[PDB]
């Protein structure tokens, strides 16, 4: 049924990743996943058979309040990162450790210092960032996890760990990079930014990183077709960075809607009025979208190393009509994007919009944990659909 046009020029070792950070909180909430045959199966095995070769996991320093109540969003700390890493490694997939260097969501608007670093002068915070990265990585190595890449920050367009001055941000980038370098010289160091469609943005950031001697290997970008411009532009801005600074480039996050329906009762991020939707909101449209960004990154040439799909399995803990019972699960296991307990850390955003999954309709599995046909885009990009 599904159609996937072969990606021309796709390298054989192209990174095909997925970020399934919410998996632990979901399994604790009772969510189960299946394979093609329809029998319960570890999602990591299913991802592996679908052609995925990399797993990305977000890591928050201390995503809990004083009493130990999870902030939600998967309650992703180092402990869960290790659980995920071991399963990724056990299923022959490399790991991408994504340090937010914050106790909660880090993005263009939010780059809050971890609670533990709130009262530290810059120098001590830098030491703390370095130390944290160093210890976290060692713990993962001790667990036998195969770490292929580390992200020093997440969508750090305007800040990092409470800092907004680029001179200080670069020192933090370097502090983190340091720890990676000291851990394993083979691990790729990536910096992650977003809004590639902004005129001159990526060019300015790359040049600034250069002027501040920031030591990194991959210039990563998020790419959500809804707001981030054309694929042509994406290729253009990433190619300029690659050519100009000799860096590898990749898409650290991307996704698309396979349905307009909200499966758990918590309003979804997409689709919405105003957003750009070049592909139909169907399983086929979702597949075209993924295949296209893979093509766009591949078009960069030798520098385009891969694409990570963001949260392809953040499915509902229950039906939309069971909203109130769902909240119980979200609140208890943090299997939603945020819990009310996060209000102390982020009162402005999480504080009033906390709840369930905002991306259940952009998963590569249906609302019941069955893999959608679009899951096989990872395989068909190499050959195309017969
Ligand atoms: O109720 C939905 C909720 O989503 C938030 O987005 C969070 C997070 O803050 C982002 O950084 C991340 O990219 O996506 C998750 C949800 O998938 C958003 O910030 C809130 O305003 C709400 O839209
Ligand atoms: Ca939802």
Token output for 211:
């002027």
Residues ≥6 apart with Cβ < 8 Å to 74: 21, 22, 23, 24, 25, 26, 58, 80, 334, 335
- Is 253 one of the catalytic residues? yes
Residues ≥6 apart with Cβ < 8 Å to 38: 370
Which among 91, 107, 108, 100 is positioned nearest to 17, based on CA atoms? Answer: 91
Catalytic residue among 36, 123, 197, 253: 253
The helix or strand, by DSSP H or E, that contains position 347, with its residue range, turns out to be none
Q: Is 337 in the pocket of ligand 1 (CB under 6 A)?
A: yes
Q: Is 359 in the pocket of ligand 1 (CB under 6 A)?
A: yes
Residue of 358, 361, 362, 363 best suited for mutating to test ligand 1, as the one with most atoms within 8 Å of CB: 358
Measured between alpha carbons, how far is residue 349 from residues 52, 106, 253, 310, 355 in Å? 33, 12, 21, 21, 11
Q: What are phi and psi of 288, to 5 degrees?
A: -60, -45
User: Counting beta carbons within 10 angstroms of the beta carbon of residue 139, is it exposed (0 to 12), middle (13 to 18) or buried (19 or more)?
Assistant: middle
Q: What is the DSSP letter of 40?
A: B
The span from the first CA to the last CA of the chain, in angstroms, equals 10
Domain ranges (residues) in the chain? 1-386
Contact 151, 98 (CB under 8 A): yes
Contact 267, 256 (CB under 8 A): no
Distance CA 353, CA 346 (A): 10
The helix or strand, by DSSP H or E, that contains position 134, with its residue range, turns out to be helix 122-142
Residue of 20, 72, 105, 345 best suited for mutating to test ligand 1, as the one with most atoms within 8 Å of CB: 105
- Quickly count: other Cβ atoms within 10 Å of residue 134's Cβ: 17
- Is 207 one of the catalytic residues? no
Distance CA 254, CA 334 (A): 23
Q: Is 314 in the pocket of ligand 1 (CB under 6 A)?
A: no
SS3 for 324-340, per residue? HHHHHHHHHHCCCCECH
Q: What are phi and psi of 192, to 5 degrees?
A: -120, 120
- Strands of the chain (E only): list them: 15-19, 54-59, 94-99, 147-152, 188-193, 218-223, 248-254, 304-310
Question: 69: helix, coil or strand?
Answer: coil
Catalytic residue among 155, 163, 311, 331: 155
Q: Is 105 in the pocket of ligand 1 (CB under 6 A)?
A: yes
Of all protein residues, the one whose alpha carbon is nearest to atom 12 of ligand 1 is 105
Distance CA 94, CA 15 (A): 9
Measured between alpha carbons, how far is residue 154 from residues 109, 158, 218, 229 in Å? 11, 11, 13, 20
Residue of 269, 316, 361, 362 best suited for mutating to test ligand 1, as the one with most atoms within 8 Å of CB: 269
Distance CA 313, CA 23 (A): 7
Q: Resolution of the deposited coordinates, in angstroms?
A: 2.2
Q: What single string gives the DSSP state of each residue in 352-378? A: HH-BS-S-GGG-SB-TTSPBPGGGGHH
Per-residue buried b or exposed e for 35-52, using 16+ beta carbons within 10 Å of the residue's own CB = beeeeebebbebbbbbeb
Cis before 271 (ω within 30): yes
How far away, in angstroms, is 220 Cα from ligand 2 center? 27
Task: Look up tokens 């907004």; give the residue.
Answer: 164
How far away, in angstroms, is 43 Cα from ligand 2 center? 20
Q: What is the number of alpha carbons within 13 Å of residue 94 lying toward its C-beta?
A: 17
Of all protein residues, the one whose alpha carbon is nearest to atom 23 of ligand 1 is 269
Using left for φ > 0, alpha for ψ between -120 and 50, and beta otherwise, residue 202 falls in alpha
Distance CA 302, CA 370 (A): 35
Distance CA 177, CA 53 (A): 24
Q: What single string gives the DSSP state of each residue in 164-202? A: --HHHHHHHHHHHHHHHHHH-TTSEEEEEE--TTSTTHH
Tell which atom from ligand 1 comes closest to the C-alpha of 355.
1
Distance of CA 213 to the CA centre of its chain: 26
Point out the ligand nearest to the CA of residue 320.
2
Q: Is 367 in the pocket of ligand 1 (CB under 6 A)?
A: no
Of all protein residues, the one whose alpha carbon is nearest to atom 15 of ligand 1 is 337
The CATH architecture annotation of domain 1-386 reads Alpha-Beta Barrel (3.20)
Task: Look up tokens 């390298």; give the residue.
Answer: 11
């Amino acid at each position: 049924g599904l159609y996937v046009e072969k990606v021309s020029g796709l390298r054989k070792d192209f990174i095909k990743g997925v970020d399934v950070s919410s998996i632990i909180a979901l399994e604790e909430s009772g969510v189960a996943f299946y394979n093609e045959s329809g029998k319960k199966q570890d999602i990591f095995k299913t991802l592996k058979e679908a052609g995925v070769n990399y797993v990305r996991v977000r890591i928050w320093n201390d995503p809990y309040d004083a009493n130990g109540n999870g902030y939600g969003g998967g309650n992703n700390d180092l402990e869960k990162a290790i659980q995920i890493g071991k399963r990724a490694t056990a299923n022959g997939m490399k790991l991408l450790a994504d340090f937010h260097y914050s106790d909660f969501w880090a993005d263009p608007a939010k780059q809050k210092a971890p609670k533990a670093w709130a009262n530290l002068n810059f120098e001590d915070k830098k030491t703390a960032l370095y130390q944290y990265t160093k210890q976290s990585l060692k713990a993962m190595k001790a667990a036998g996890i195969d770490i292929g890449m580390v992200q020093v920050g997440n969508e750090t367009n305007g800040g990092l760990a409470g800092e907004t001055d680029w001179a200080k941000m670069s020192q933090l980038f370097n502090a983190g990079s340091q720890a990676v370098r000291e851990t394993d010289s083979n691990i790729l160091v990536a910096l992650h930014f977003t809004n590639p469609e902004t005129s001159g943005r990526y060019a300015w950031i790359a040049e600034t990183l250069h002027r501040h001697h920031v030591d990194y290997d991959v210039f990563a970008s998020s790419y959500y077709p809804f707001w981030h411009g054309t694929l042509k532009n994406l290729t253009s801005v990433l190619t300029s960075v690659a050519d100009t600074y000799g860096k590898k480039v990749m898409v650290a996050e991307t996704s698309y809607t396979y349905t307009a329906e909200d499966g758990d009762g918590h309003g979804n991020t997409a689709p919405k009025n105003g957003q750009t939707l070049n592909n139909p909101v169907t399983v086929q449209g979702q597949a075209n979208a993924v295949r296209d960004v893979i093509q766009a990154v591949s078009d960069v040439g030798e520098a385009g190393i891969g694409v990570f799909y963001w949260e392809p399995a953040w499915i509902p803990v229950g039906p939309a009509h069971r909203l109130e019972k769902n909240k119980a699960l979200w609140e208890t296991y943090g299997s939603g994007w945020a819990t009310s307990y996060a209000a102390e850390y982020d009162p402005e955003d999480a504080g009033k919009w906390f709840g369930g999954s905002a991306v259940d309709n952009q998963a590569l599995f249906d609302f019941k944990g069955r893999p959608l046909p679009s899951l096989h885009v990872f395989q068909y990009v190499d050959t195309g659909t017969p």
